[PDB]
Structures are given as C-alpha cells and as structure tokens.
Design a protein around this ligand. Structure first.
Ligand code: MG
Ligand code: MG
Ligand code: MG
Length: 986
RNA sequence: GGGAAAUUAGGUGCGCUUGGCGUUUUAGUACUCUGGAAACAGAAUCUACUAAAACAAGGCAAAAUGCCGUGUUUAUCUCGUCAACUUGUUGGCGAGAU
DNA sequence: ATTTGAATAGGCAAGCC
DNA sequence: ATACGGGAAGGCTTGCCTATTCAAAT
DNA sequence: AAGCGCACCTAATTTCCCGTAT
C-alpha cells in the first residue's frame, strides 16, 4: 500500500516460510508458511515403470495373437481345436525327431512365442532348451523360476530344428518358417521406441536425437556440435596452445606459424601429444613452457583429435583426412546413428570419395557420444580468430557481439531437479502474492546453504581421486588387453569384483574374473538395501552377486535373507566375513558396511522415519539459479528490488546468540520464525535490541496454507488380487496365505493354531494333514516355530498326508481372514470362477456433504467413480445416485460442500484439514491439525494415544462449514455452488 | 567475490527397449475319501506341479515390430468477456468479494 | 440387573528383482 | 590498486477392519 | 534384474572473463 518492508524467505523441501517486516522500525508486519507434499522421484518412477510394464504385457499378448493368425492361415488351428491337455515340453522334445499332430504342433509353437528369452549387447552373434527343460521337470519336479533364463538364440536354434522336422509332414513353406522366426526373435530397439500414435514416440532417429540434444549458448536456435567433430576438437586444441606461456626470446605466446606447424606435426601425427613433442617442434626446453592442463596424477594433458586419427588409421588418403567438412559429417553420423547397418546406408547417401571397404570399417568405430557446448555455427565463426590472435573464446564472442508478475515458466528452462523445482515454483507464487498485497519490497532475502571446502579435505579428495583414477586406468587396461568390449557396466562389475575379493557376498562363492568377462549375465549388481525401500543407487548400496542369489534375496536386506531358509550360508558367517573385509585399508566403506550389516526392520514405511541419508543440501546451484532469475526480472522491468542471500549456518548462530531455541515438535511455525530472523539478520548483527526479538518471539498471528490436491486419475486401488470364501456362518471372507513356514523366527502359524485352528482351510478339507501338523506343534512347542525344529532335526519339509509317504511338500497355508465389505469386484475377468475375485483399498477423490432434514450426511466419490472423456473428466452419474441411495440422502437435501485432500473443514466449531474417509459405511472422516501434526501434538504432551483423528458425521453433528486459505494463509469462510461438480477440464 | 570452457572423479533426472518372477481363476495330473477284481467312475477343492487366461477400473483401434490409462500444475465464490462441448455447465483472461 | 448398540482404541497390509 | 561478514556451534501413510468398554433399553 | 540415449549437478585441476566496494 504505502509502508516499505523487507521480505524474508526460508525455502525448504516441503515448505516455503515467509516473513514481512517494516523497513524503518523492524516490527513484524506478517509471517506464514506454505506447506506442500515433497516431490519424490519415487512417484514418477512409479508411473514410468508401470507404463513400461503395461507395454511389455501388451506386446507379449499381441505376439501370441500374430502367431495364432499364422496358424489359422496355414490351417493348423481352428475355432474348435483342443489344445487343453498337451504338455508343450513333451511336444517340443518330441517334435525335434517325430511327427507332431496339428494340435501338438500348435501347442509347441505357441509355447515358444510366449516365452522367448533375452537378447543382450554382450553377444555379437549340446542339447536344446526343451531337452534341458523336460529333464528338470522330471528330476526336480518343476521348470518355472529363476533358473528358467535362456538366450533367444538358444530358442531360435530349437524352433528352426522343430520346423525342419515338421516341414515334411505338415504342409508349410519357407514363407511360414521365415514369418514365424521373425515373430519369435523380433523386438523394438531403444532408439525406435513406441508405435505410431504415442505421445511418447518419434518419427525417426534424427527427430529422436534432435529432440534430446541441447542448444548453443551464443546462437540459441541451433543444436550443439557433437563432441567429436573435427572442428570441435581442433577448437579445443587451439585453446590449449593459446593458453601456453613460454619463457623465450621473441613473444611469450605462440605465433600463427608456430601453432600451424605444432598442429600439423604433433596433433595430426601423434594420437596423444606430450609436452616433449611440442617442446621439440618449438626447439625450446620443457621447463620454459608453462600454463597447461594437468591430469590429477600430474602428467601434462593436451587435446586429442579423435576423428582424424580414427579415419587416418583406417585409410590415410589426403583427399579424405584433410577435409574438415567431411570429418564433421562422419562424426555427426557416428554419434547420431546407433546400429552399423544404419551408419553404412547414411554414409553411402553422403556421396563421398570413400570406398565400400572403408565405409564398412568406419561403421564399426566406437566412443562417438555426447556434445560440445557450442554449435558448429559458433565454432566456424571464431576459428580464424583463435588461429591468429592468442585470445580467449569469451573475448572474441564478446567483441563480435511486458510482464506484470514473475512468470513461473522461466524456472522450467534451467532447474530440473524434481524436489527443488516444486519448492521454487511455490516460492515465486508466494513472492507474487506478497508484491500484490503489500506492494514491492525494498529487499528480498533467501536462505542459502553454502558448503566451503577445507584445504585438508580438498587434499584428501584429490588424493582419493588420484587413487580412483589408477584403479580405473587398470580396469581400462584389463578391458583393452582382454579384447572385451569397453562398457560402462563392465567397469562397475570389475570394481565390485576387486572390492569383494572376487567373491559373491551372499554365497561367499568365487566369481572368477575370466568367467565374469565371458559370462557377465551369470553375475548381477544387487542393491544391498532394496531400491523399492530406499532411494539409494550409490556404489555403497551395490554388490556383485550370482544371478540365482539375487533372485532369492528379492526385496530383503542381507540380514532378512540370510536369516531365511533360502540362504546357503548363515548371517553369522556373512557378518564375520564383512567385518574381516572392513579391517582392510580401502576395502569397504563405512556406509557399505552399515548397509551390509543393517539389522533393523526396514520396509518402505518403517524406513521413512529412519534413514535421513543424503539430504537435499545440493541447492547451491539452485540458490544461484533462483537469484539470477529474480535479479534478471527486476532489472528488465525497472523495479528497485535488492535480492540477496544469507548462509544456512548463520541463522543458527543468531538463535544461540539471542537465546531462541529451534523448536522441534512445537509446529510448522519454526519455518516462519526462521524467515523473520533472516529478515532482521542485519539489524540483529548490528545490535549484537531485546525489544525487536521480543516482537519475533512473542508474535502469534502466524498463517498456514496447506496445498489442496484435486487431480483426477491418480492411483485407483491396490494391485493385489484376493480370492474369497463363505465360512460356516455364511460370511464372505478374504482368503489369506501363510508363507515362510520354515523360518527361525516366525510364530504366525503357531499363534494361529493355538488361537484359531478352525481358520485353516485344511482344518476342514485335509483333516489328516491337519492332525499330522498338530503333532509337530505339540512336539516342538517350546520354540517360536515348531516347523523350524522339524526341518533342523530331521532334515525334511512337512508333506501332505499320504498312505505311501508320497504327498507333496507344504510351502504355503491358506486361512480365512477379514470379512469382505468395501471392495472392487474383478470376477468377470475369470470365467466360471466359483468364488469371488476382488481388489482392496478404494482410494478417495473427495466427499460431498449434504444437510438432510437437520442431519449431516456425506457421499464418498471414489477415483473409480471418475472417468476420462475427450478432454475432460466426468464424475459418473449412476455411481453417484447409487451412492446417495445407500446413504439415504433425500431428493430434498441441500448440498453443503465438497472436501478434497487438505481442504479445510470446521466440525462443531473446530477447524481441521481433511485427509480422507476412514469408513464410508460408519460415516467417519480422517482429519489432521493445521499448525502442527497431531502425532507431534501428542508427543510434546507426552500422551500415548493412537496419533490419528477420526470424526463421525451423524445426527449429533451440529455444523459443518468449509474454509479456504490463499497461498499466504489468509483464511476465508467460503461459499459453494448449488450442485456438486461433474465435469473437470483441469 | 560472481561467471565460463576443457579433462578427470562421482552423482541425479527424464525417456525408451527387454527378461524372469509374483498375485488370481479355470483345466489337467498327483494327493485324500467312496464304490470296484481291474480298467475306471463319483466326491472333495485341501497341498503341489504344468498349461491357458487376467492383472491399476477401463478406453481407442482393426492383422499392425499397433496406441493410451498411477507424474507435473491446481484456494473458493460472484460478475463481464472469449473458447470448448456436455447446451447449461466448466476452462482461459480481467475485475470484485470472502 | 443383564444384554445390545455406539464410540474409541489397537492394528494389519500395501508388486517385485 | 586490491578483496568481497565467518569462525563459530530435518519424516509421520492411509484405507479399513476387529476387538473392547460404557451407557441405555428390555 | 539386463541395457541404451540425452540432459543436469557436485568435487578436483588448469586457463580465461567480469562488477562492486574498500
Ligand atoms: Mg532454513
Ligand atoms: Mg536383487
Ligand atoms: Mg525451513
């Protein structure tokens, strides 16, 4: 309005605090907090992963259907053909010698196409798979599982033989055989991506690459150069030489002729120039030359012309090798195109003086990736200036060279880290809302978190890097000498191999380096702490293990896995080994050791409270980025606003200095009262007055603004499927399963038998096996798991009752669980299912309150109740009227409001924020407190209730009102429309 | 003190391509019961294996290496104006109130 | 004096490598 | 013509069911 | 789990550029 002020900001992961202070007096004007859900990478990773899975399953289904059509066409399959009782492993093994029936033949081909193995980068090009598979079926009693992993080439070898034999007896031609093998072996590449129509797709390779690659600095509407173009490497070569300073008679910097002869005789002759070779061309001692790039080890480093040497080595024709424009084109193609057969065509279309022999050698070159920072346009501009003048690139480009509110799109271009992007978008929206309400600030301040590096630390880091380089160089040498393909995945495995003394950490069995190199697929990089639980992809959370061991461990810690019946070794043995490995100098890091020896119960939710891990301190680039965005904005529009930043640590100092304890468990206000300190900081530092901090500390009128989510088509329901059963009383119940029966510390079954023997299905259905199990529980009652002792003492799993001791092992036990109420019924996907097939956890969209003859009532609208149309979502009318009927809501009932997640609700005069509908049936809604989480409210009190609030909406309820806050946290009793919303455009 | 480029060491993100499982139903075989000299028939749906099918609810498409569906942004209401399709409602923009 | 209904508290489970 | 205040000392997830305790009605 | 493209960030090393305040 008129009064001038300062704007403090405490930007956070979940919050943006703000503080506003009179520029003259330094009295608090206002202060508040804007709270939001942390933007976790898990969320989108989920969405992407599931999109991937959906395509894999779609493509399998479509491949099976393409095969069927081919069998219909060659009249091997009909609508009325019996494929039901035909064991395809028998039919595969039979058909490699004898005639199959049309049905057996169809069974076999369909079985192959369903499951057709891996095809991996590793390969460049005595029994069959079906022979080995039938052998295991007979010996081990089973086929499917982790050991069922074969190469597609192994499957194609079988199919070709099957079709060679069968071609005689069935009428099928080479067209059939060619078609079938294509279906079987074929798949899309990473650079093809989806089919036509995809929002995620692309037309061709160049479109694909153009979309991805970055833009030039000095010429924005131009894509960068590829890293290894001749002019790009020659550019980098000249900058090195221009930086050189020599102590000689004559000019200290190099002259044109000297640079020319150096490039021609050193950089074009020698693959890796050395200071000696440059020193000889000048005819001056090495020590005279100073000002060169240095390797971490200490060697002088000079730019290497990649393409020149690569092509020269193939063919040294001066027509080719002394033509920059061609050497830039070849480079581009080699970077952009991916497969050799694509490169060959693209070179042949280039219309050059290269021969087909030469082209075929060019197409098998490696290491062409990445981009230079400039475009060719920018390089070809300045190349003459670098040739002649000993000038810096910046100097040459320097020589030759609306809005009302801060727009939120401008962050998008440069910040890309999901968490931070969200905090910043909120922060700009918060600043805009203040500038509107209070006019322009004099100063804006932001909490920077700077981390200066100590000298001793730098030295250690340098020493560490020096040590790491040596290991990497050796690994590279091993790959160079073994003749094996240089790969970014091989280096990691080799590093882990050396770290682990060439042993699998889970089995302690040897991983021979030679075997690792020849059969890399037998060994997998495992996460110590599951990726699904943690967010750690660091080397410290990675181990090299056998494929089989990785499959068995699953989403368990080493402790959980090695304590199970599935492990080859005991946890105690493992622990001893790890501790022994830790005794060495640079064997295993402390963090890795801790992960390997993690004994806490670590699941996806339990770990949330635990494991602060690597926090988001990486906001230095961000803080710089933000203030550059803001300063730019004010500068352009001519607004006198002084944007600043202060160090993270500094705030804490003033708190200790002025005796103002950072209050955990007191509420969200801490974020705001941090902001007010930032705003005063300068004044506080000058008067090393109690009165001003009295204002900050005694201030009360804080404001909170929780963000409200109204997005349709979020997760609808939980994935898991459940069978049901009607019990003795005629109550439909979910069927559960007890797994891990033979584990040391598992008392689930022993508890269940003592409490509720009648809950087991085998109590009713296999009484003889039940009585047989009860004798075990009685025998080894004293332990946690009677079955563990049964396995330990006798060495035999519990088998179903049989007269001749030939019943199968028992591995899971089904028992009756909870009663079935709120569910989604998916039973029509299972034709002739006797019982009901269901999913659980109907996830809420909103709830709509109604006032009916003085009685408050509400409807839950499920996400399932909302359906995408052309460009809008629609709440389903039939589902909605049905829902009102179960709630007995009259046609003469007044609609009050709709409550989304975090919407504000005043129930009997008490304000809360909405979480959801605890129970539709009982009419309960879960809420939370506004200024503090209810959990923390109870902790500060030292109360031991459950930390959840539930509110019943009933004839007892007296008033329900909806409230709303602006972004700043100004609170308003809000009005509603006459009817609920049905359409949602976005 | 800010910014830039090169090399090295180490991370993060977005997008794509595959494998093997897991959950559930139906069928077959084994397991248990009954009848039968035997082949086998009926019951039971427990415990195990193999096959086929489904896997966020669903929506397009039409023989195709077919395509989409769990992310992002997102106080509320009224009035003017433009747009959309559902034709009386909701999006964008501007103004006002809570 | 005993039985039934409503409110509050205890608690399990959630797709993967 | 040259240095830019520094050494100092923070998480909640929720949908929903079952079991236990108290007050009102038969 | 296998494996590919592009982008961005941190740290270390060498060189270059620029503005404001003491
Ligand atoms: Mg802070
Ligand atoms: Mg694993
Ligand atoms: Mg904070």
């Amino acid at each position: 309005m008129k009064r001038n002020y300062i704007l403090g900001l405490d930007i956070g992961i979940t919050s943006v605090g703000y503080g506003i202070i009179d520029y003259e007096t330094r009295d608090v004007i206002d202060a508040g907090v804007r709270l939001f859900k942390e933007a976790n990478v898990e969320n989108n990773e989920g969405r992407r992963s599931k999109r991937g899975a959906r395509r894999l399953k779609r493509r399998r289904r479509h491949r099976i259907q393409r095969v069927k059509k081919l069998l219909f066409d060659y009249n091997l399959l009909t609508d009325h053909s019996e494929l039901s009782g035909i064991n395809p492993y028998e039919a595969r093994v039979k058909g490699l010698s004898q005639k199959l029936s049309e049905e057996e033949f169809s069974a076999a081909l369909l079985h192959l196409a369903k499951r057709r193995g891996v095809h991996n980068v590793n390969e460049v090009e005595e029994k069959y798979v079906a022979e080995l598979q039938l052998e295991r079926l007979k010996k081990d009693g089973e086929v499917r599982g982790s050991i069922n992993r074969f190469k597609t080439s192994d499957y194609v070898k079988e199919a070709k033989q099957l079709l060679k034999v069968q071609k005689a007896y069935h009428q099928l031609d080479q067209s059939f055989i060619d078609t079938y093998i294509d279906l079987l072996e074929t798949r899309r590449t990473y650079y093809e991506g989806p089919g036509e129509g995809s929002p995620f797709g692309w037309k061709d390779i160049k479109e694909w690459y153009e979309m991805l690659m970055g833009h030039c600095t000095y010429f924005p509407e131009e894509l960068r150069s590829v890293k290894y173009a001749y002019n790009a490497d020659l550019y980098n070569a000249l900058n090195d030489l221009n930086n050189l300073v020599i102590t000689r008679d004559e000019n200290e910097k190099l002259e044109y002729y000297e640079k020319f002869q150096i490039i021609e005789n050193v950089f074009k002759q020698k693959k890796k120039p050395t200071l000696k070779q440059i020193a000889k061309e000048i005819l001056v001692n090495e020590e005279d030359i100073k000002g060169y790039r240095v390797t971490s080890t200490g060697k002088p480093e000079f730019t290497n012309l990649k393409v020149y040497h690569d092509i020269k080595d193939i063919t040294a024709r001066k027509e080719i090798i002394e033509n920059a424009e061609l050497l830039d084109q070849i480079a581009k193609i080699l970077t952009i195109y991916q497969s050799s057969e694509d490169i060959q065509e693209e070179l042949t279309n280039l219309n050059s003086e290269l021969t087909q022999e030469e082209i075929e050698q060019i197409s098998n070159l490696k290491g062409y990736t990445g981009t230079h920072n400039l475009s060719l346009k920018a390089i070809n501009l300045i190349l003459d200036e670098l040739w002649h003048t000993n000038d810096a690139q910046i100097a040459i480009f320097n020589a030759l060279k609306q809005q009302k509110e801060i727009p939120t799109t401008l962050v998008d271009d440069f910040i890309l880290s999901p968490v931070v992007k969200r905090s910043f978008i909120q922060s700009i929206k918060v600043i805009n809302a203040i500038i509107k309400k209070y006019g322009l600030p004099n100063d804006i301040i932001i909490e920077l978190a700077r981390e200066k590096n100590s000298k001793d630390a730098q030295k250690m880091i340098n020493e560490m890097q020096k040590r790491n380089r040596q290991t990497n160089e050796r690994i590279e040498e091993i790959i160079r000498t073994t003749g094996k393909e240089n790969a970014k995945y091989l280096i990691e495995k080799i590093k882990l191999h050396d770290m682990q003394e060439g042993k699998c950490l889970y089995s302690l069995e040897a991983i021979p380096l030679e075997d690792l190199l020849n059969n890399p697929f037998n060994y997998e990089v495992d996460h110590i702490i599951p990726r699904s639980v943690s967010f750690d992809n660091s080397f410290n959370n990675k181990v090299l293990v056998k494929q089989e061991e990785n499959s068995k461990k699953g989403n368990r810690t080493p402790f959980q896995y090695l304590s199970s019946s599935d492990s080859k070794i005991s946890y105690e043995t493992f622990k001893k080994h790890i501790l022994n490995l830790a005794k060495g100098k640079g064997r295993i890091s402390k963090t890795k050791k801790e992960y390997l020896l993690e004994e806490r119960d670590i699941n996806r939710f339990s770990v949330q409270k635990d494991f602060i891990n690597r926090n988001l301190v990486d906001t230095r680039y961000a803080t710089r980025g933000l203030m550059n965005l803001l300063r730019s904005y004010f500068r352009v529009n001519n607004l006198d606003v002084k944007v600043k930043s202060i160090n993270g640590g500094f705030t804490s100092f003033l708190r200790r200095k002025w005796k103002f304890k950072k209050e955990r468990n007191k509420g969200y206000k801490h974020h705001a009262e941090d902001a007010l300190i930032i705003a005063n900081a300068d004044f506080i530092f000058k008067e090393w007055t109690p009165h001003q901090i009295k204002h900050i500390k005694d201030f009360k009128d804080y404001k909170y603004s929780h963000r409200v989510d109204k997005k349709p088509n979020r997760k609808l329901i939980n994935d898991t499927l459940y069978s049901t059963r009607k019990d003795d009383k005629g109550n439909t119940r979910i069927v559960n399963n007890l797994n891990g029966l033979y584990d040391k510390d598992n008392d689930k079954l022993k508890k269940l038998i003592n409490k509720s023997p009648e809950k087991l299905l085998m109590y009713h259905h296999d009484p003889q096996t039940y009585q047989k199990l009860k004798l075990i529980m009685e025998q080894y009652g004293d332990e946690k798991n009677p079955l563990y002792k049964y396995y330990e003492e006798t060495g035999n799993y519990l088998t179903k009752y049989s007269k001749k001791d030939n019943g199968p092992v028992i591995k899971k036990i089904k028992y009756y669980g909870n009663k079935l109420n709120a569910h989604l019924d998916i039973t029509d996907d299972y034709p002739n299912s006797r019982n009901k097939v269901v999913k659980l956890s109907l996830k809420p969209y909103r709830f709509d309150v109604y006032l009916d003859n003085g009685v408050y009532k509400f409807v839950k609208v499920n996400n399932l109740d909302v359906i995408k149309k052309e460009n809008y979502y629609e709440v389903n009318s039939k589902c909605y009227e049905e829902a009102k009927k179960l709630k007995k809501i009259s046609n003469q009932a007044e609609f009050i409001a709709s409550f989304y997640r975090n919407d504000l609700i005043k129930i009997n005069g008490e304000l809360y924020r909405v979480i959801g509908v605890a129970s539709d049936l009982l009419n309960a809604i879960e809420v939370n407190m506004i200024d503090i989480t209810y959990r923390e409210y109870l902790e500060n009190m030292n109360d031991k209730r459950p930390p959840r609030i539930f509110k019943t909406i009933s004839s007892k309820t007296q008033s329900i009102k909806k409230y709303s806050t602006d972004i700043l946290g100004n609170l308003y009793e809000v009005k509603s429309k006459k009817h609920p919303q049905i359409i949602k455009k976005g």
